[PDB]
DNA sequence: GGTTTTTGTCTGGCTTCACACTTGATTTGCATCACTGTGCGCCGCAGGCCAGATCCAGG
């Protein structure tokens, strides 16, 4: 991670200086969207669907109201 | 009408994914069976062993 800062510590400046001009400065989703379109150019369409399902909390993860319904409706105590 | 956005196009060509079928060969889903519990209370009990108070009939 520290060397992924050391190798991208100029392109990181490029993406934060383009983020404020193109949309306004939203640093997460612009590189997310570049990663989606990079999978499009790399031609994986199911993998990007798993990506957006994760980033909507669907393909795994289990949004915590559903886990609450599972912990409640099967008589599971909190320790179990 | 401008201004930027929002979608459309191109054809040649690249990878990427679905399907044509079939016969087992699994794996996965769902009914089916005869039942459960929540429908009310209360306190010392049960089982057994033994020293000691009753007792009751024969000498």
From Swiss-Prot:
DNA-binding region: 1-56
Result of changing residue 7 to A: Impairs DNA-binding and reduces hairpin formation without affecting nicking activity
Outcome reported for the amino acid change (mutating residue 2 to A): Defects in converting nicked products to hairpins
Effect annotated for changing residue 5 to A: Reduced hairpin activity
Tissue distribution: Maturing lymphoid cells and central nervous system.
UniProt note: domains: The RING-type zinc finger mediates the E3 ubiquitin-protein ligase activity. The NBD (nonamer binding) DNA-binding domain mediates the specific binding to the nonamer RSS motif by forming a tightly interwoven homodimer that binds and synapses 2 nonamer elements, with each NBD making contact with both DNA molecules. Each RSS is composed of well-conserved heptamer (consensus 5'-CACAGTG-3') and nonamer (consensus 5'-ACAAAAACC-3') sequences separated by a spacer of either 12 bp or 23 bp.
The protein's role, per its UniProt record: Catalytic component of the RAG complex, a multiprotein complex that mediates the DNA cleavage phase during V(D)J recombination. V(D)J recombination assembles a diverse repertoire of immunoglobulin and T-cell receptor genes in developing B and T-lymphocytes through rearrangement of different V (variable), in some cases D (diversity), and J (joining) gene segments. In the RAG complex, RAG1 mediates the DNA-binding to the conserved recombination signal sequences (RSS) and catalyzes the DNA cleavage activities by introducing a double-strand break between the RSS and the adjacent coding segment.
Family per similarity comment: Belongs to the RAG1 family.
Binding partners and assembly: Homodimer. Component of the RAG complex composed of core components RAG1 and RAG2, and associated component HMGB1 or HMGB2. Interacts with DCAF1, leading to recruitment of the CUL4A-RBX1-DDB1-DCAF1/VPRBP complex to ubiquitinate proteins and limit error-prone repair during V(D)J recombination.
The protein's name: V(D)J recombination-activating protein 1
Classification of source organism: Eukaryota, Metazoa, Chordata, Craniata, Vertebrata
Gene this chain is encoded by: Rag1
